[PDB]
């Protein structure tokens, strides 16, 4: 059958021509969903590789209309899960956000649907990453060009040490290796957030390896967890682990007592404004201080 034929012969190596022929497949017949569904999947993958995310989004909306009746729920959810899993490794924050929101809207009332919950969790974590990124941006600064920290070490983003070598080229090489392109010492906000998320995952693992921090960290909500991560960024794991009384009160959710006790530390006396914001976060469990 020629819908079959169009789809199959279409897969080729002039992506613009291949994509236009896929458009041909939706145009040619389309309505029976299986072949139009596969064509749209292909086009979404091809635009994701071609880095044209607007077109990818528009063709993803097309695909969703197929799942209500044109394609079996098992198969459609398989396809959407695949799309999720090969876009989970993208620095593209806004694309991920829009994708997640559209998926959530589309699957809201889908009978016996299990993907809405996975995407909703992913969007929650995305919002959380955005908030922690902004928090640390406010407390430590964001810099999109390579610079020297107070030790003279090449750094970028939010305190992301690139190297202790005095060679600027060595720093650029480490940066290119970590970002995956010839950046010439300059990066986007999104690339800065990728490095920062890596640094966050690191700090989280460290917190979990610390026998004094793991209890309090587990006990806390996501926002207060960010406050604790903030302290770890500022002082390191064992430095934070010295707040024995405050850590215990925190683990007990004695928010006001914990805040009062944290305000009497040397940390507060030394960096009052940052400590003030962090303690507000510990107390209220909100981002209001940021």
Ligand X SMILES: O=P(O)(O)O[C@H]1[C@H](OP(=O)(O)O)[C@@H](OP(=O)(O)O)[C@H](OP(=O)(O)O)[C@@H](OP(=O)(O)O)[C@H]1OP(=O)(O)O
Total H helices, total E strands in the chain: 16, 3
Question: Judged by CB under 6 A, does residue 283 bind ligand X?
Answer: no
Please, which residue, 47 or 246, has the CB nearer to ligand X? 47
User: Which of the residues 43 through 62 are near ligand X (CB under 6 A)?
Assistant: 45
Mark residue 223 as left, alpha or beta (left: phi above 0; alpha: psi -120 to 50; beta: remaining): alpha
Which of the residues 140, 176, 237, 257 is marked catalytic?
A: 140
- Segment interacting with ligand X, rule: CB under 6 A, options 15-23, 37-45, 96-104, 256-264: 37-45
- Residues preceding chain discontinuities in the chain with C to N over 2.5 Å: none
Residue from 82, 121, 165, 184 binding ligand X (CB under 6 A): 82
Mark residues 5-24: x for contact with ligand X by CB under 6 A, - for none: ------x-------------
| Smaller CB separation from ligand X, 82 or 169 | 82
- Asked if 139 is an active-site residue, the reply is no
Dig out the tokens for 198 from the structure: 């890596």
Q: From the CB of 46, what's the least distance to ligand X, in Å?
A: 9
In angstroms, the CA 138 to CA 141 distance is 6
CB closer to ligand X out of 67 and 207: 67
First to last CA, the chain: 60
Q: Which is nearer to ligand X, 82 or 286 (CB)?
A: 82
Catalytic residue among 12, 105, 149, 190: 149
Nearest distance in Å: CB 33, ligand X: 12
| Residue 117 burial (10 A CB sphere; 0-12, 13-18, 19+) | exposed
For residue 156, the SS3 value is: strand
Rounded least distance, CB 276 to ligand X, Å: 49
Task: State in angstroms the smallest separation of the CB of 88 from ligand X.
Answer: 13
- Chain-centre distance for alpha carbon 249: 31
CA distances from 108 to 59, 95, 124, 137, 278 (A): 20, 20, 16, 34, 36
Eight-state DSSP code of residue 221: -
Closest residue to ligand X, Cβ-based? Answer: 82
Candidates 18, 26, 38, 187; binder of ligand X (CB under 6 A) is 38
The total of other beta-carbon atoms located within 10 Å of residue 192's CB is: 21
Interface residue with ligand X among 79, 183, 230, 261 (CB under 6 A) is: 79
- Is 140 considered catalytic here? yes
* β-bridge partners, 147: 155
Least Å distance between CB 80 and ligand X? 9
What string of H, E and C letters represents the secondary structure of 164-194? CCCCHHHHHHHHHHHHCCCCCCECCHHHHHH
Spatial distance between the Cα atoms of 165 and 290, rounded to a whole number of angstroms: 35
* Residue pointed to by tokens 């994701």: 48
**Residue with smaller CB distance to ligand X, 18 or 247:** 18
CB of 16 to ligand X, least distance (A): 16
Residues that bind ligand X (rule: CB under 6 A) add up to a total of 6
41 forms part of the interface with ligand X (CB under 6 A): yes
Chain positions contacting ligand X, by CB under 6 A: 11, 38, 41, 45, 79, 82
Catalytic residues: 140, 149
């Amino acid at each position: 059958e020629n819908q079959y034929y169009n789809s199959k012969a279409l897969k080729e190596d002039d992506p613009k021509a291949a994509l236009s022929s896929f458009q041909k497949v939706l145009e040619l017949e389309g309505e029976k969903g299986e072949w139009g569904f596969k064509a749209l999947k292909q086009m979404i993958k091809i635009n994701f590789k071609l880095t044209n995310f607007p077109e990818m989004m528009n063709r993803y909306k097309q695909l969703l209309t197929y799942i209500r009746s044109a394609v079996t729920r098992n198969y459609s959810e398989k396809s959407i899960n695949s799309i999720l899993d090969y876009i989970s490794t993208s620095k593209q924050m806004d694309l991920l956000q829009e994708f997640y929101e559209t998926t959530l809207e589309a699957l809201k009332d889908a009978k016996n649907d299990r993907l809405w919950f996975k995407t909703n969790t992913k969007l929650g974590k995305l919002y959380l990453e955005r908030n922690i990124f902004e928090m640390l941006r406010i407390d430590e600064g964001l810099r999109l060009k390579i610079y020297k920290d107070t030790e003279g070490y090449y750094t970028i983003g939010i305190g992301h040490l690139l190297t202790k070598s005095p060679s600027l080229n060595a720093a650029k090489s480490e940066l290119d290796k970590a970002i995956g392109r010839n950046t010439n010492g300059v990066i986007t906000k999104d690339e800065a957030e990728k490095l920062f998320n890596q640094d966050v995952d690191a700090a989280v693992r460290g917190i979990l390896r610390n026998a004094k921090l793991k209890p309090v960290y587990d006990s806390l909500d996501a926002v207060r967890r960010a406050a604790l991560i903030n302290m770890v960024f500022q002082m390191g794991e064992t430095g934070v682990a010295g707040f024995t009384n405050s850590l215990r009160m925190l683990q007990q959710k004695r928010w006001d007592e914990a805040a009062v006790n944290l305000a009497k530390s040397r940390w507060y006396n030394q960096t009052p404004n940052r400590a003030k914001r962090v303690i507000t976060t510990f107390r209220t469990g909100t981002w209001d201080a940021y």
